[PDB]
């Protein structure tokens, strides 16, 4: 040893101790931050980030909604979109979806709940639907003004809804008919 | 005359349509719904595809309507069975039934689709240059020790 080898082994001990402690600490960091993130915080949360872009259709009801809404979040998003570069608006719905699939998660598409969960259930199964709906709309059966068909088709739609025909039909064409299937991966194995 | 628009999966083409004729040419949700609604209301129905393929709307200049709403108001069709969003501007010119499907605007994001490929976890936290360096320090004390 001769006291020089002792201090070499001691300073070396300090060195390797610092290094492995650093490894453990930084690995703890990389693990913690990995478990510290959630996929969907909120519809507003998507607006509160300036990296992940978000868009709607160029000519549609969604855009007009965002413009017309006086709610702070939606106005902020619209103010963003009309000045955003490049443009977050798309020509077709498929254009927007295709943009989502090629973004590596760097672009979000805002669309009808139905179309959303349908694309979610259609190949190549690359699109996930997150969060609750941002509004409340509905589809209905249109009849001519003061026609002889209005009341009966109304009552009909109602009865069909109550018997469960509508739910079963929707479930069939979304889940039974087309399938990404997998039974939602057993709820993604928890 | 039931007017509707080709939109998947509401009203679709079986692709064998060249062989068939009539309401057997179209398949989808709204087709089946039209069938049941007609079965409860008691009438024979003929499915017709709208000529422009765009839902209702109105121009400020012409003042006219286009799409399925156009075919209903100007009397080109008897009923519109399709995923038609109920708005105020339509309920003025047409009579809407109660909603048969409720929906809203939701957010779509690219699915995670991640299964961890990394063949070495240990070199992630520390930089590669740092490992090379610590090898140089190892040999650097090793030469002193020798």
């Amino acid at each position: 040893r001769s006291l020089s080898a002792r201090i070499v082994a001691g300073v070396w001990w300090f060195f390797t101790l610092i290094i492995i402690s650093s490894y453990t600490a930084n690995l703890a960091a990389f693990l913690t931050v990995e478990r510290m993130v959630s996929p969907i915080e909120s519809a507003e949360d998507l607006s509160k980030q300036t990296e992940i872009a978000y868009g709607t259709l160029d000519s549609g009801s969604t855009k007009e909604f965002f413009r017309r809404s006086k709610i702070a979040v939606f106005d902020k998003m619209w103010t963003y979109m009309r000045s955003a570069e490049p443009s977050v608006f798309v020509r077709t719905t498929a254009e927007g979806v295709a943009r989502v699939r090629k973004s590596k998660g760097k672009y979000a598409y805002l669309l009808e709940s139905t179309m959303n969960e349908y694309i979610e259930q259609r190949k190549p199964c690359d699109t996930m639907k997150v969060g609750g709906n941002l509004d409340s709309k509905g589809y209905g059966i249109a009849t001519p003004k003061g026609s002889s068909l209005g009341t009966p088709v109304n009552l009909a739609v109602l009865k069909l809804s109550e018997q469960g025909v509508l739910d079963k039909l929707k479930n069939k064409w979304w889940y039974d008919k087309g399938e990404c299937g997998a039974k939602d991966s057993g709820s993604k194995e928890k | 005359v039931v007017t509707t628009i080709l939109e998947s999966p509401y009203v679709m083409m079986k692709k064998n349509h060249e062989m068939l004729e009539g309401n057997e040419r179209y398949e989808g949700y709204c087709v089946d719904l039209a069938a049941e609604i007609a079965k409860h209301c008691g009438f024979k129905y003929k499915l017709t595809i709208v000529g422009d393929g765009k839902y209702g709307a109105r121009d400020a200049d012409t003042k006219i309507w286009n799409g399925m709403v156009g075919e209903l108001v100007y009397g080109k069709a008897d009923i519109a069975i399709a995923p038609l969003t109920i708005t105020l501007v339509r309920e003025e010119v047409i009579d809407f039934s109660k909603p048969f499907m409720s929906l809203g605007i939701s957010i779509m994001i690219k699915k995670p689709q991640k299964s961890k490929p990394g063949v070495f976890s240990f070199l992630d936290p520390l930089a590669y240059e740092i490992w090379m360096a610590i090898v140089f320090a190892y040999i650097g004390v090793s030469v002193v020790l020798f």
């Binding site: 070499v8 300073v11 060195f15 | -």
Partner: peptide, 28 residues
């Protein structure tokens, strides 16, 4: 994601060779 640590660890890395210099200083 971070998890790239470089300069600081390079410093604490750097003090060791100084310790080797001190070792040679004491050896002679």
């Amino acid at each position: 994601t971070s998890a790239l640590s470089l300069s600081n660890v390079a410093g604490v890395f750097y003090i060791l060779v100084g310790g080797l210099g001190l070792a040679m200083l004491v050896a002679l």
